[model samples]
Target: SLVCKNALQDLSFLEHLLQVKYAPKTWKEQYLGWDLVQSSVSAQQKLRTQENPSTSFCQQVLADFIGGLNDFHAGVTFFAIESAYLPYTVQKSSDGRFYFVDIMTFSSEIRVGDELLEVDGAPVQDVLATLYGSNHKGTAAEESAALRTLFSRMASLGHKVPSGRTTLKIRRPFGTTREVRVKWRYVPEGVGDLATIAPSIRAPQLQGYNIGSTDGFLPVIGPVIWESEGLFRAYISSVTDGDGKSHKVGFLRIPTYSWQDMEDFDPSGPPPWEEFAKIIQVFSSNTEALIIDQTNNPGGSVLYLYALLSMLTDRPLELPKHRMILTQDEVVDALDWLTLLENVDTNVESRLALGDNMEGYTVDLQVAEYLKSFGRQVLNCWSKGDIELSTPIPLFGFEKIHPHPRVQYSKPICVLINEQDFSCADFFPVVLKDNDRALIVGTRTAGAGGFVFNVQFPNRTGIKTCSLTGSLAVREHGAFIENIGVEPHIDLPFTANDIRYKGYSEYLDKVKKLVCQLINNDGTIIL
Candidate 1:
């Protein structure tokens, strides 16, 4: 009885918050046309009348309610527990086939590049549908996102802890087929104690304070230049032009925009910006063309993103704009920011005299100026009657960011992307494509285009926590980056051949052709 009451209370609070705080509500309604409010209310009513509802059922109801938004950032976390995982990961190719991409446990029968046919006697598509039906709306990009959660079932909404073995039917590369049963592997060993479980439940979302990094997947095929494990790998390779002349091309693979330390902003910490600048210096002088691979990148700090953009060009690049859905709380927050900025501006001399760090002060001042401009705009919107959305403005104060002082890469550039890239990954290519800085290649990114913040209900009911989109990112041409992701200038699909045998070599070859064209055009090829 208590569980049912708590669940109802949590759902009610979540509904109130979504109606009031969610930034993409208007845009989502306009584009996807999802009736999020009605969905949440219906879930709440259903849960309210249930007698002796199980914990998993309550969690799933809340998960479905949040997932109906189709926003990756919007999700509910019931518990923070270690997730169950199969020994291997699966990949779906553009040809509509599933294949074993990465294998962890030693198995004589199963191998990488083996095609997946069925799971526990069900067709592969049926398994995928069962896993993704409640959580994701089936778009091309969303389908890829859904597949990612297949093997690694993180303890979050709509996922249960696995206790038994499951059988997989797979076809070998040589056309032979067989069945294999694999047990679920739990990380950190023990799973009986819920208290021992660490929170690994939420979806990957940018926290916006510090930069982070993730491991690279694509193999660098050249004399290795510089590398930091899990952060980036740079190499020098040769590509031939139509005239049969060989040109030195540099490749830098950035698996993710995330870094290790959450609090440290120093250049020498996790992201190591200064070291990255030195690498840019080397690529500028040695390579005729450059390729930046951010294929599966989950985004990190916005400031870190700006810093990277600063190093890539010698000109001032405009930062992306954002518009917020306004409420009294948002208005109060804007006012608070204004007050803080005013205090900083007023005490600049006193604080500097009292030994406040000069560099930190400069950055803070820049942010202050930016927020001041945005704060006034927020107030103006609030002043007008019935205004729920603020006019789009550059959220970060600088209208255009200047190039890095020490090093900058001015050569023709190409960026590699895929459906897996999200948040800052989505923003990275959008900035470059809009400014005509680099030629974007590959599939559309996962369109999680807003900063996320976690919300906990007051009484702590059925839902323990929920994440919601706080601000909507706007493109330079007045389009919102909510559900509409940035499309590539060159459409390069990951073919079955590339996944099964070639391992991105064919994709790189096509990119080399594009790079040669970029060189011929003197880097003026804009899509």
Candidate 2:
């Protein structure tokens, strides 16, 4: 059964079976999720020092689990393997910025945030000697396998029959002698690609087509990534919140873009509409947008797409924004009790869901009064006062800005993309491209799209496993850019000569040539 009573014991069993079933066959290949194991170890360490070992939820365990993944795509999952894993998804960073984050972690003790370290006793350069093999800058089969476990549900990883065992001799910070054994298995073959593996194997993410690609390259590198050889990446900004006035202004940074703004909008959180509204305020002003900044962005920000689209078009897109209207009939039975509770203040006792085991049984009388008056219409503060008959709940906005019937940017409006430009960032270009807003300037992007997944592991280990998740109905045009990244209007790449001379000007020259050709295009296909 997928749900196990004893998570660790069941995981051990699944891993043992997969080792034998999927064989390069040796002690060397019985792979287990090393990051998970290490996290469990680290988690156990913290538990040993806790005064409230009896009351901690699995949060600390999960944080440590996610943190232990020394490489990309290696971790303990908190959600289903097919969908969400870590808070972050497995987007292949274009411009290699995110890739740099992964690669830099290659130092046995320090991975400068993005650099390939080594492979079984050799430098990463030596290990990936052949371009045919997956191109993990400083990774080994073990790393790939764990990432495979992480992206197992994502078909973009290639539909290899996942046998839960792999052994890797990794060159960690100490040296190359580190051996990590990972054990994992596929969830049942067709249980929507998001189910659990055999008892021996455990996974945290579920696979979905929402995160897939149809680009020219199949993933020969890590499972989550299906990258083409050449791609240019750029970091438009950081995700952190800061002061806009003090921050360096350019294509590379933004502030509050700020929780400070959030306080003005809705301090509760950055809801979709408010977030989208803000994006337009900042971005819609760009008259001649190249949109090249979408390369390394992995769709982290939510409200960006709506804002971006609205800015490009001349008119607002009109769509239905309907939220469920609660019928009086549905809560009619409780209305009498609700009115009585509001009319007469009572401090009656109540039982909680946890029985006597729950410690917070003692509720103060004043707090009870506050709870009773929670929804009542009060002179100053009451949510009931905010209610109207036709309550508007914004599920998705339909108010898209209608585009100009003709071309918008007459200048060189090009978009550079890659796997790292995933999720929301990925969709930004797709919308512009579909509207003929920008010419694509890079190679295939990470197959991941706007909506994606999160994962939970079986061990109750708090590690996060992430993958792309959503597949929506109102299909965006460029969903197919995953495997086949959008071809540039001027498909420019570094030639052997360019690499030999180490001159990017040649590459840029080629790019200029392509732009000239595009400008000369007679609009045969505005696509």
Candidate 3:
């Protein structure tokens, strides 16, 4: 039912969208120094010359075309079957070797900490390059993402599933080496249907295990103070400082910035913000210091990001600015939103009529006002047709966001991040670090600066959907957050012992000690 022609049609449509709709096109080209237009055209030519190219071949061509951009936000989703994966998953250690971190099958001979040496006859790294390749921008976070694709044949990206059994050479934790054979497991769910598929316009949230989940590395020392499944979890722990005195510290694990779907619609379950507010209240009174862990976080809503930041610091925080690519349609839409916001701003009765007494309404009003002001700036740029990039404006509309009136935590805060943290996760630490509010402790984050927007082409194409970066984020210091992620002040990379034997105890101890030092010190050291 699918053919090369369908793929070409999809690619053509995608090419058109990138020129007009994608905001980061110019920035990526100039900053990352890649000619995306040329790459797309080349792929088109190659596809045209092939005689009866198979569906897999067509899909790979399209996938690679977008992959060339090295932007995680820009991707193609093919209408394909479910993914085929190995029964186990592997993780890269500080030693730069792959280790078996999780195993699904109990009968497997491989142990959890075994180091992967080879695949078939070739070296492991070489095999991985042949299998997953360099599809991502070479940030530490992007590298982590590429490593995850090793045993998993992701259908969305058109990776070919392993057909049969393969041999793996591994070194055991005790330094013994052995060769073992493993079979690929395929779980069939259903066939892809065009009618059921639709392009997602929302920005893609990060995918990972929450820090406090059963599978997460961090141990829950005591009873959970508060939790919202898949969003965040909080608890209290005591850490000993250099002076041998223990200090009570609050541990808050935020797995995501997305709170939109967390509400269960049950009357007993309070809203995410209220739940978060209560947690902050407890931390404010009880804990001497706070550690907000977002290790494997991807990113989420900007408003939610602002809300969380507002509670953490009492001072006004300046968020990142976005430089957008402009077009007539974008300009017109901005004007419409500006006009509506202006009308709402003038009518106090309309705001009162909503009767939503939640503080969320107040935050929305502030965000709306920021957008209204931003829209006026867009109009000025649009009046001059030569202005390709609009004036840089605050990402959420306000130049600087003030602290939340009701809930605030003025304690010394430390944010834990890793290579996996991306987008809003990247944004979060950047704001905190830039404001001198929190001490970032971990490896570098994924520099996925801009938010994403998806595009749906004619359903006839093999490509069901595609997404691209809509805007580029600029730091307050005039640096782009695209490839250069937030570097932690206290850089602590995970060791093989951390992943295999010690259960990240060493990493945790160091973090706790740092937080204790932060609490005891005058806070002048952070600046």
Candidate 4:
């Protein structure tokens, strides 16, 4: 039984997990919630079956452990497999079947109309059951939505499955069932397509749909691209009006946010902030209106959300107050995570609080760092004021605008999105919509804005995990954007008329025309 045996050996880890999930706002109460954690663990221990406890019971318990954390973003996984793949797209149908949408590169092995029935030796359902909420979010749609990318990139560096190839049991057109073995090769950093492996894998970012006599002849407008470790791609295409000429309305596609592949890529490398400014500058200058497409973008960084918004206006933007769950111990770490560029005022404040003439404080240069000591002062301040309620919460804002010459764009921008626009991508349009900055179009986003951090304890199992430690509030009444997505100002949902071969490009062209009509008629869908 897991009662005495620590399935998760680290007591402090369990303690922290409970605090991060159930007791984020109640640190004082969290200090006193150890018994509650103990009881919860005890109940799970008693309910465990005699099945293979290592993989089965342990995985489920950890799943149950993280299930209460956040639906938007948070999970724990028992094992991870590294795999590589051909560039392709898999989308969940309304009838719950995974269909191949678009296959990049001229591959004769797999077609665009094949339906993936199984992965490895197991059915897709059996495979997804393990990955459903534990590895990703807990919805059937999320599980199915995450199917193909996870299947393609299931293998990672320093982590490969027990084999070199993962066989896909697929169904081709005319209902012919067959198996194809795909190799699990290591894809290097800055070396692969963002649509294949990144969390934003579901982003409808491909330009593969226009396959006619005008295939190579279509005059695409802007080839805006940014590369660090990975690519930040945006395609701006010209719209031909009824007069057989190009209109002022252009389709600007920003599929993924910052560098989608590399996590620890050089920040000093070519900044994406100014690069995106250059992309939008041409559109803002030449065009009267633009359709900013972020359809399947699964989000990137929160910093870029502010950066993207900064492209639209020069006004000093006031972001929602950021309140994080700080333990009596984790306060220092939170301060470091929340710290912006250390300006003059911040340096003076740190010195006054942690310097020689410190007010009722003890600061030891020998061991105690300046920032760490400042964190201690912050804790004392929060101790008097209830940590749950808002007092002087550390507010996150953006003022330092991009220094490009054509930075400020105050034109009519129609931002397009869908259910797959996740995390910071989701947060981007929310901030814009809330402030009435842009006219939000398309369906609601992939509601996933709870701030999360990945963690692991090897002694527990070979389980890598992620959990929600804090959330971002964008309003004074503490309105957070997790689980609750940004609703569309104008609800325009679309169904793919032809998922068998041609992707949503036909529908996208239709969307572009509709948006042009709106822009031409001063933001009206019906002209």
Candidate with maximal TM-score: 3
TM of each candidate vs. truth: 0.86, 0.37, 0.88, 0.65
Per-residue lDDT tens digits for candidate 3, residues 143-169, read 677677777786667676565788889
Tens-place lDDT per residue, model 4, 1-527, is 33224454533465466554432334322422324455456535633544434333444455555554434455555443434655666665545676777677675677887887887888877776655432244543365344634545442211223336678788988889989887645544332322233344465767932111112111233332322213234444456556565566555556555443323445667655555666677666676666666666656655455556666764544455444544554555536523521332444454444452221122223112333434444565567653443343432322122222346666667787666667767776776676666678777776665455556656433355545545444443455555556777776654434355544554455666666665666655564
Instruction: Name the candidate, 1 or 3, with the larger lDDT value.
Output: 3
| Best candidate, lDDT | 3
Model 1, 38-114: lDDT tens digits are 78778877787776666656677878788878887888876535468877667777889988877777766788889
Candidate 1, 505: how far from true, in Å?
1.9
Stretches of candidate 3 off by over 4 Å are: 131-137, 187-215, 221-231, 261-268, 343-350, 353-361, 364-368, 525-527
Residue 322 of candidate 4: its Cα lDDT? 46
Model 1 stretches astray by more than 4 angstroms: 49-51, 80-83, 133-137, 186-213, 223-231, 261-271, 327-368, 385-387, 457-464, 525-527
Residue 513, candidate 2: how far off, in angstroms? 3.7
lDDT of 3: 0.72
Residue 18's lDDT in candidate 3: 80
lDDT pick, better of 1 and 4: 1
TM-score of 1: 0.86
Candidate 2 lDDT by residue in tens digits, 261-359? 322344455443333333333433332122333444434443434443443455434322221222243234234434544443333432221121111
Against the reference, the lDDT scores of all candidates come to: 0.71, 0.33, 0.72, 0.52
- Return the clash pairs for model 4, or none: 81-154, 81-155, 82-155, 82-156, 83-155, 203-296
Candidate 3 clashing pairs, residues 3+ apart or interchain: none
